[PDB]
């Protein structure tokens, strides 16, 4: 597909030409758009701005110097003068604080009262606060505080290698299992440019292979080596470990670039990024002239963007004579990747493993939540060293497992010691997640019950005994019904193999299978379905069409996506304002594909300036761009969290509720204490703030001004309905697919059933549910998309 | 950390009663202020008179334990067999005493004396 790359390059130069024309239109629109008193005003602004700028920059320079006799004297002088300035501003703040703390008996105010300025340390300090209350109620001491007088106070007589640390660092680096295999690996690198590397984890391949390429001197002319990762946090861990191996700070020759965080200071040799990054410089640069060797992450995730990267890397290997590209792997299923890459060589690396002998239950059962608890207790009565991990497949049963295990553990006192239980979610606040990585107490047999985060993403030390019921949720989408179901399924054999690989990471594993070995050998599948067959592809069909590829149904892949998914994606992009009569991308389609969120969400932006109110639907799209769920619904509490949810409620769906959440989070200091007091996760909505910031930055490229209405929420819902015309259903039934619907209990309109409503998502778990509904009247529904809408 | 064995000895001691530090509902009990005065003015609201007006089992804690009184009273009355010689236990023909266990409409009156438990006591 060399002509595909030529067409892609030509589309990049005409995209640059369209960007230049839009830039010229932007400066055309921009050009079409007392003396001592002025001196004192200019000096006031100049010294105020320069004072706050130098005061901001000085401790940043001291932190940069700390991260990096005369210099020590200058650093001591700078530390003393910044401490002096800090206490000077603290003395001024103290004067204003004692000016605040007076009596000031209240004026009789006509009308409704207004809330004045309020706090303290809210997250987690109420326990020690109430302990202080009990200690104050408990402590009894009489007399005055001055009682040290008349004390004789008799006393007791009693009776009359830093270079070694660096050499230990290279000894640890030479202790890797890839260290005997590095010469044959670089020889196979010099042999073929498409070499596939397999090997079970713990071998340190992804840290040492770009390292051994860096002492191979492949970055010599300035063509930097790139390594991609399936997730950002693992990229941070790998880049931090490589930087601590080198002793070089990040932003330098070991550097990273992920979403909202690009620490690369234009000297980066080892560049660590994600697959969305590599798709983004494919969307900006046609050929990797600035990249010598691209390191590819493992395909056992089977991430959708990594499959797109596999197709583009195969097109590059058709096009370029050499790049020495290389793909990591975990298990032995590299024959498909070898045959995909034109009989690619396969190099295997052994890793450090332990006996992870799989046990058995001689019975088929379909409960796996009482038997797992009994298995945890029976593991707790046998062999004392080890930590226990239990796999599960959802929030609502793992909180019940935590409650059941806590009730069984509290039923025994001095018998059965410790057994602290910690759950893992994705929508868990990060303090409970960071409690896992703390070391266990010496009398404890620490149990970390978990979902598949510990299987795929997180690596936790000390685990020996691992339960596995062999069930995981799948986000399966049916394009024949236009409906997507997240349903619990039995797992795969490779998933159980990587679960056992996660089991005996440090010591000899004791992985307990929770079903029969006959069903494992025969009934259990051996291959996990990838992402492109399970899910809809409406986000990335526009990405493939923006890169000049027209043969979407004949594009190269590891396995082809189903034609019904592509048919519904192309039918939606026909219904959206991006495709021509010939199925070609318009300039509005270039505006669709500029900003990277989903097109069905990106019609908010093209609906903006048609109904104004751009910032409100921008923040609405920011909360609809989140990954983890908003609002905190803990085990117990309930009533306070439900009241905090109801306090944000507005008429007209929960999009206005999310807009109200971002509005009240504004003019509040963006504090974590406000989100803690209102049961909002301060991990997922900071991501919404960053998404809103990135989409605000990407507003000149679409040429949409910062427009707002301040009250016209009918205009906001009209712009949402202009963005959402395909996602409508009414009559306890879909208006198009004729599928019955049920309102979700977590929605703001669970009661007060509406006359006309739209939505955002159609996840089926138990009933066909209703996620992110909104009130409409089906009056402006005919005003937008008239080809799709006819006859009520 | 503070273990179970650190506070197992001092578990039911103290006038604020150390175990009150680890109640289930202590977080919403942290906002309960001025409750002794609520009892001493709840005598003006509730018709029945509270003898335990001066304490609260969630705040102050359980300030007494009378579990030994029942065992010592059973011992001082002559043991279980010496108690059951006075009763109709032998007439019931039960094999042992260890398995023993006890217990929207309109009406003309309901303030009358329930004669059934007095009859079974007699």
């Amino acid at each position: 597909e060399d002509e595909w790359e030529r067409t892609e390059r030509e589309r990049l130069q005409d995209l640059e030409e369209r960007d230049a024309f839009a830039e010229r239109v932007r400066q055309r629109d921009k050009d079409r758009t007392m003396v001592p008193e002025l001196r004192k005003k200019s000096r006031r602004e100049y010294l105020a701005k320069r004072e706050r700028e130098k005061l901001e920059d000085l401790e940043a320079e001291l932190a940069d110097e700390e991260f990096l006799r005369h210099e020590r004297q200058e650093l001591k002088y700078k530390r003393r003068v910044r401490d002096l300035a800090r206490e000077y501003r603290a003395a001024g703040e103290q004067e204003k604080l004692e000016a605040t703390n007076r009596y000031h008996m209240p004026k009789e105010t006509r009308g409704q009262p207004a809330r004045a300025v309020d706090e303290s340390g809210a997250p987690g300090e109420e326990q020690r606060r109430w302990e202080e209350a009990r200690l104050g109620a408990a402590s009894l001491k009489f007399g005055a505080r001055d009682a040290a007088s008349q004390e004789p106070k008799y006393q007791l007589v009693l009776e009359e290698t830093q270079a070694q640390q660096k050499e230990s660092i290279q000894a640890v680096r030479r202790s890797l299992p890839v260290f005997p295999f590095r010469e044959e690996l670089l020889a196979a690198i010099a042999n073929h440019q498409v070499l596939i590397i397999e090997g079970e984890t713990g071998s340190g391949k992804t840290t040492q292979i770009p390292q051994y390429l860096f002492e191979e001197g492949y970055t010599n002319k300035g063509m930097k080596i790139a390594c991609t990762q399936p997730r950002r946090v693992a990229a941070m861990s790998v880049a931090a470990r490589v930087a601590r191996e080198m002793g070089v700070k990040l932003g330098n020759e070991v550097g990273y670039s992920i979403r909202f965080e690009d620490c690369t200071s234009e000297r980066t040799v080892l560049r660590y990024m994600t697959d969305g990054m590599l798709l983004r410089e494919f969307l900006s640069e046609p050929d990797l002239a600035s990249y010598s060797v691209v390191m590819v992450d493992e395909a056992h995730e089977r991430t959708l963007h990594t499959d797109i990267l596999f197709g583009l890397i195969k097109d590059v290997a058709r096009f370029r004579p050499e790049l020495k590209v290389l793909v990591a792997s975990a298990t032995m299923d590299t024959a498909r990747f070898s045959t995909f890459f034109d009989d690619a060589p396969v190099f295997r690396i052994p890793g450090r493993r332990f006996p992870v002998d799989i046990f058995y239950t001689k019975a088929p059962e379909a409960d796996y939540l009482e038997a797992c608890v009994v298995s945890v207790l029976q593991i707790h009565v046998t062999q004392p060293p080890g930590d226990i991990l239990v796999f599960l497949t959802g929030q609502e049963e793992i909180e019940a497992a935590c409650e059941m295990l806590q009730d069984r553990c509290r039923r025994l006192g001095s018998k059965i010691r410790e057994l602290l239980v910690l759950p893992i979610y994705a929508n868990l606040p990060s303090d409970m997640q960071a409690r896992i990585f703390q070391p266990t107490p010496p009398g404890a047999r620490k149990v970390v019950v978990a979902t598949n985060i510990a299987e795929t993403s997180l690596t936790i030390e000390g685990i020996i005994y691992v339960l596995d019921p062999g069930f995981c949720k799948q986000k399966s989408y049916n394009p024949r019904t236009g409906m997507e179901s997240l349903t619990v399924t039995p797992c795969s054999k490779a998933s159980a193999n990587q679960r056992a690989g996660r089991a005996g990471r440090v010591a000899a594993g004791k992985c307990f299978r929770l079903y029969t070995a006959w069903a494992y050998q025969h009934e259990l599948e051996e291959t996990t379905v990838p992402e492109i067959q399970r899910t809809s592809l409406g986000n990335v069909v526009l990405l493939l069409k923006s890169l000049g590829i027209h043969d979407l149904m004949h594009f190269d892949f590891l396995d082809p996506p189903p034609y019904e998914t592509l048919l519904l994606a192309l039918e939606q992009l026909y219904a959206l304002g991006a495709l021509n009569h010939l199925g070609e991308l318009t300039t509005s389609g270039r505006k669709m594909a500029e900003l990277p969120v989903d097109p069905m969400l990106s019609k908010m932006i093209l609906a903006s300036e048609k109904y104004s109110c751009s910032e409100e639907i921008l923040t609405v799209a920011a909360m609809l761009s989140v990954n983890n769920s908003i609002f905190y619904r803990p085990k117990d509490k309930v009533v306070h969290a439900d009241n905090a949810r109801v306090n944000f409620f507005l008429p007209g769906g929960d999009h206005l509720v999310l807009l109200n959440v971002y509005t009240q989070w504004a003019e509040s200091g963006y504090s974590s204490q406000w989100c803690y007091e209102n049961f909002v996760q301060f991990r997922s909505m900071r991501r919404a703030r960053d998404v809103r910031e990135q989409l605000e930055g990407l507003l000149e490229r679409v040429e949409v001004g910062l427009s707002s209405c301040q009250g016209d929420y009918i205009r906001v819902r009209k712009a949402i309905t202009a963005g959402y015309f395909y996602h409508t259903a009414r009559g306890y039934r879909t208006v198009k697919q004729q599928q019955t619907v049920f309102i979700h209990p977590n929605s703001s309109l669970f009661e007060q059933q509406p006359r006309w409503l739209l939505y955002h998502e159609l996840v089926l778990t138990t009933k066909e549910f209703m996620r992110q509904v909104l009130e409409i009247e089906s009056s402006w529904l005919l005003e937008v998309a008239p080809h799709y809408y006819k006859a009520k | 950390r503070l273990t179970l064995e650190d506070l197992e000895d001092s578990w039911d001691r103290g006038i604020p009663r150390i175990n009150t530090l680890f109640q289930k509902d202590r977080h919403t009990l942290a906002y309960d202020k001025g409750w002794r005065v609520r009892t001493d003015f709840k005598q003006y609201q509730v018709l029945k008179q509270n003898p335990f007006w001066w304490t609260h089992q969630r705040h102050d804690g359980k300030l007494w334990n009378l579990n030994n009184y029942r065992t010592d009273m059973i011992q001082a009355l002559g043991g279980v067999e010496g108690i059951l010689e006075h009763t109709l236990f032998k007439g019931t023909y039960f094999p042992t005493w260890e398995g023993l266990f006890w217990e929207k409409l309109t009406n003309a009156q309901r303030s009358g004396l329930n004669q059934i438990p007095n009859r079974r006591f007699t």
Partner: peptide, 28 residues
């Protein structure tokens, strides 16, 4: 709970531990 009881008696009133603490205070 004999081991926890010897732990409590080593964490008891213990003038020997006060001798150890004052000896390390005077020596260092």
């Amino acid at each position: 709970d004999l081991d926890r009881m010897l732990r409590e008696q080593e964490r008891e009133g213990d003038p020997m531990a006060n001798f150890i603490k004052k000896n390390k205070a005077k020596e260092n």
